[PDB]
From a paper:
The connexins are a family of transmembrane proteins (21 isoforms in human) that form intercellular channels for cell-to-cell communication. These intercellular channels establish a ~1.4 nm pore that couples the cytoplasms of neighboring cells and enable direct passage of electrical and small-molecule signals (such as ions, second messengers, hormones, and metabolites)3 and therapeutic agents. Intercellular channels are constructed by a dodecameric (12-mer) assembly, with six subunits assembled into “hemi-channels” that dock together through extracellular domains, resulting in a continuous ~1.4 nm pore for intercellular permeation. Here we present an electron cryo-microscopy ([name]) structure of native connexin-46/50 (Cx46/50) intercellular channels stabilized in a dual lipid nanodisc system at 1.9 Å resolution—providing a near-atomic level of detail for this class of membrane channels.
Structure determination by high-resolution single-particle [name] resulted in a high-quality 3D reconstruction, with an overall resolution of 1.90 Å (gold-standard Fourier-shell correlation (FSC)). The quality of the [name] map allowed for a detailed stereochemical structural refinement of both Cx46 and Cx50. However, the significant enhancement in resolution allowed for a detailed refinement of side chain conformations and notable improvement in precision at functional sites, including the NTH domain and the EC1/2 docking sites. A bouquet of 15 ordered lipid acyl chains is held in place by each of the 12 connexin subunits, which appear to buttress the channel assembly by filling a cavity formed at the lateral subunit interfaces (blue). Remarkably, all of the resolved lipid densities in the [name] map are specifically localized to the extracellular leaflet of the bilayer, indicating a selective interaction with the local lipid environment. In addition to stabilized lipids, 396 ordered water molecules are resolved throughout the channel (33 waters per subunit). Pore-bound waters localize to regions of the EC1 domain and TM1 parahelix, and mediate an extensive network of h-bonding interactions, involving D42, F43 (π-bonding), E48, Q49, N63, and R76 in Cx50 (positions 42 and 43 are Glu in Cx46), and several protein backbone interactions. A cluster of four waters are buried within the EC1/2 domains coordinated by residues D47, E48, Y66, F70 (π bonding), S73, S204/S192, and K209/K197 in Cx50/46. Four additional waters are buried at the lateral EC domain interface formed by neighboring subunits, primarily coordinated by hydrogen-bonding interactions with the peptide backbone and sidechains of Q49, D67, and E208/E196, in Cx50/Cx46. The degree of coordination of these buried waters suggest they contribute to the architectural integrity of EC1/2 docking domains and may in part explain why deleterious mutations at D47, E48, and D67 in Cx50, linked to cataract formation, disrupt junctional coupling and/or biogenesis.
Residue numbers in the entry:
A (entry chain B), B (entry chain C), C (entry chain D), D (entry chain A), E (entry chain E), F (entry chain F): 2 to 109, 149 to 236
Write the structure that this text describes.
Amino acid sequence: GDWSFLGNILEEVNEHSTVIGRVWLTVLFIFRILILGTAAEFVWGDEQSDFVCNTQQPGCENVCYDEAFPISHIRLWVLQIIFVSTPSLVYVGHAVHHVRMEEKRKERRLEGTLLRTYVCHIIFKTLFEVGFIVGHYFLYGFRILPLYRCSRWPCPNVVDCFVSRPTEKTIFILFMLSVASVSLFLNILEMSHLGL
Amino acid sequence: GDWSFLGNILEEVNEHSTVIGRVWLTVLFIFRILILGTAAEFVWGDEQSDFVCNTQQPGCENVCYDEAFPISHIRLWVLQIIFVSTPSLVYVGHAVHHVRMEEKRKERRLEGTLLRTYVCHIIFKTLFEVGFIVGHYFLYGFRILPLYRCSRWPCPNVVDCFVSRPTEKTIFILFMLSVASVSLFLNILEMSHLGL
Amino acid sequence: GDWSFLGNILEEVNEHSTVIGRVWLTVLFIFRILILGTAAEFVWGDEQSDFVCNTQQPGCENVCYDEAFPISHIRLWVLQIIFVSTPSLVYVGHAVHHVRMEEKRKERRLEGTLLRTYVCHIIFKTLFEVGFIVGHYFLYGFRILPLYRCSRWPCPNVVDCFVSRPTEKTIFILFMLSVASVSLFLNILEMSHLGL
Amino acid sequence: GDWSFLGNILEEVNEHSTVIGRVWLTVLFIFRILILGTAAEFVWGDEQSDFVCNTQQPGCENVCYDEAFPISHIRLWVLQIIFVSTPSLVYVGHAVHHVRMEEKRKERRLEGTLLRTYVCHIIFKTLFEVGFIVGHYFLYGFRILPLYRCSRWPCPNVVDCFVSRPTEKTIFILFMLSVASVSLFLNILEMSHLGL
Amino acid sequence: GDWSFLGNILEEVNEHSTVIGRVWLTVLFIFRILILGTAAEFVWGDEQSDFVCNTQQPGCENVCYDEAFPISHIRLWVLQIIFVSTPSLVYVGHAVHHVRMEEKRKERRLEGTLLRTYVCHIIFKTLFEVGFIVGHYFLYGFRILPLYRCSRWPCPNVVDCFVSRPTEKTIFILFMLSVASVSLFLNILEMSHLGL
Amino acid sequence: GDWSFLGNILEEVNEHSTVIGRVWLTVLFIFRILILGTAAEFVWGDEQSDFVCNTQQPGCENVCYDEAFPISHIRLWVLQIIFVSTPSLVYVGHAVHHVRMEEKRKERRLEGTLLRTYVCHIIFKTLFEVGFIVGHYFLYGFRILPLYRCSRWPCPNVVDCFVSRPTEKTIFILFMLSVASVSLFLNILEMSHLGL
């Protein structure tokens, strides 16, 4: 996973953001992207290969892994990162559009419409963070148990399947939840600081 | 997969495109290339290794995977990305050719023929996006089912084969479809904005 | 596969080539190198590991894969890329040699001998492209069939072996053939444009 | 694992730190990050794949690996690196915030509040290092024994499981402990040097 | 395999070498290093994993692979590349040492001792190339046959072992031999051009 | 393994070292780091996966590999590289500290204390090189034999285990020993050149 493109564009908008937005962005780079690439990706690497079911039924392990894990937590966190970063991109686009307009108009900072855009970007970041948190909760909760019982066809009756590294995965699930909540708190502080 | 070459050339044509073309390009980099490399590629990594068929027939799994998946979705999205990016390259080539001509002629922006070229590039992008969407639909639809039934020789009669990660794959199929449709809408907005 | 060295040297000779040579080079970077690294390499990744033969004979699968695939298509395309790029390197070497000579002589563009060299480079590119196309045809044709029948010792009598991903491989074989033919047409256009 | 982001930001704060802080940072880069990526990661690569248990019970190896290794040492060292680096980031943020304020105020080094912040950053680094050391001790100690006995369900009675590379892992555990303790000593020297 | 260090230093000595030395260096980068990383390394990737012997004897395949392939061709070509590049490094060191001396002496091109050093560097390159060619011949010849017969203990009597991809390996062996011989011819031309 | 950090810092101290220290550093980059990453790492890649023992005893192969190879040669060479490079870092730190002091004092080369530091750095490099050589000898000698006999529990009685690629490993062991000894000779020459 090469995050160079997103990185370069978000460090562009480091220069154009509040101090609390610079903290938010540093958190995104260090506690989410870096963790994902240096730790979480390896934890989930053998998610299906080490998933085992007590059965001689061909196909059962496939369908039971798929039912237990409709989308891997790591893919969900990738999507979360991209969607929470998208409003920053929108804002920096608006800002650069104004810089190029000012240059052109001459040929021919957080005030006015850039403030409304910044506040909206904060709002959307907050809502997307909340949405991904809630979705994670309803999909998986915040704990992976070792045992998963499966009755999906072709599995005969109910079969016992065993998850890879449930405890390490639980630790990283809770870590990512905490990081997301810190991000939410930072966004709240941004709104308060702007208001006051 | 190293997209550095294409990246550098398309960020060259960031400078020479409309604001809506800059949004289109950002979408290409973040929601297509980045997703493909940080998420989709890993989802499809074990596509054949975890594809299983209920048979003792040598060769059957090979032919049944090949019949179910004549071309992996990820390869199809790579091709789509390159073909939808090709008209941008043509346009930037025309533009740089005019810049070098102007420099030479001196030794010796979206107006005139560059406008016709830009509009044609938008048209071709739209048509290629539509073509890849339609091709995806006819080849696979927008859902991967866990079970695939196969009667290709050497398989005896009909055999039941089971796909790897059908649900996660379905999620990413729909995600990529939505991103492609957003790109189409952006191209339509480009044509409208130019007209008006 | 790291193509950085070749890339840097061929983007050096972007500056010193015709507009049609810049199109040829862009095609080389995007439709050949990029495809190879982002798509084809993964398609052929399990070429021998998923090659299966219906036999209990030790050694047979090894010799039958080797007879079916004396050289993988991807290695052949790597060689093709390097050989079709070599004349460009020769030409840019001649050109830079003249630039350094002019600088020296001062201490002490496509005209003259650089034109003869450019035309010769086009000729050699054309001949190498044709040669690799013809060699591909005679070695493999343009279709990989699922079944390969093998009688190489130690295989007893004739054994049935099954190829990995024959259809996807056929798609990429035809795609690379088309890209090579486009390159040929571009070289022809270069010669015509120079003549006229 | 790509540490480029963190690296660039910590080499930013090389310029703004004491000589002993530059030694601490060099130790972080060379003896922790570099060791982790060039050595430790490969030692732990086959941690679960080569973990074996003497049993015919489906699921037992999964639960026994998970009980023996709730979190891999390498993931724990990644977290440790990030948390001990976080206060440096806070300090450099404060410092750069003051530099940008001074620039602005003009439009309109370790003294004052930057000294309090630097001392606090040292304190937090020390406490986090101590906490990770203590946590490592209580979780695993400083030795990995080859044999792990496991009675977690579904394992019948007590089963004997065998760890991959216990001795090499013990060597690297002790090496990382020593490096952490050197870092602690460096922080103590920082506080003393500032006081005197 | 990261050749960045060697690359940067040899492109330093591009600037300080003859035109024929620039051709030699381009050949080294494109036809040896690039081939090795984009093609040969993958051909030899499954050298031991796909090496099979017709035996039920534990250990036999290990000892028979080791006897057949005391050193993989790819490792031998890596060593060859480094040793044939070493004299270039010596020469560029001498040249830069003279440049820094001239700068110093001021504070306080291929003529004289730099010519003797250049000629010696050519001589050593030639001798090392010849030595690696001869060593390759005596160790393996220039053909890998599919069958290798092995009588090394613990193998009982003589066992038949089968090599992975003998034909593709033979093609690349001959290709690398030809590239080495081209390098030799280039060195001879260097000596002649200097003499005349 | 990413050596970029160490590389950049050691090429910083290229500028501040003797000619013999520049040779030592080039040897470190080319004959140790580059060999390790382009050759040795692949030779040792299947060290445990291809290690086989003639036994039906669960756990025996694990404990016997661990007893035969308490620390892989490649990890030992990584540690050696870092420790022999550490004194260079100390010296360059002292030198840069003096450069920044001189700049400051103005606001307000190998002579004096920098000579003592340089000599001490040479001494420590020599001692660490000798120590790693001696440790290698006592741990493994300079030859890996194919057969390793093991009586570690749970292995019943004495079992015969077979090492992966003993001959290639022996070649690289001797190569690295020779490179280390060349480094020692270079350090001796440094001391002599400084004395005379």
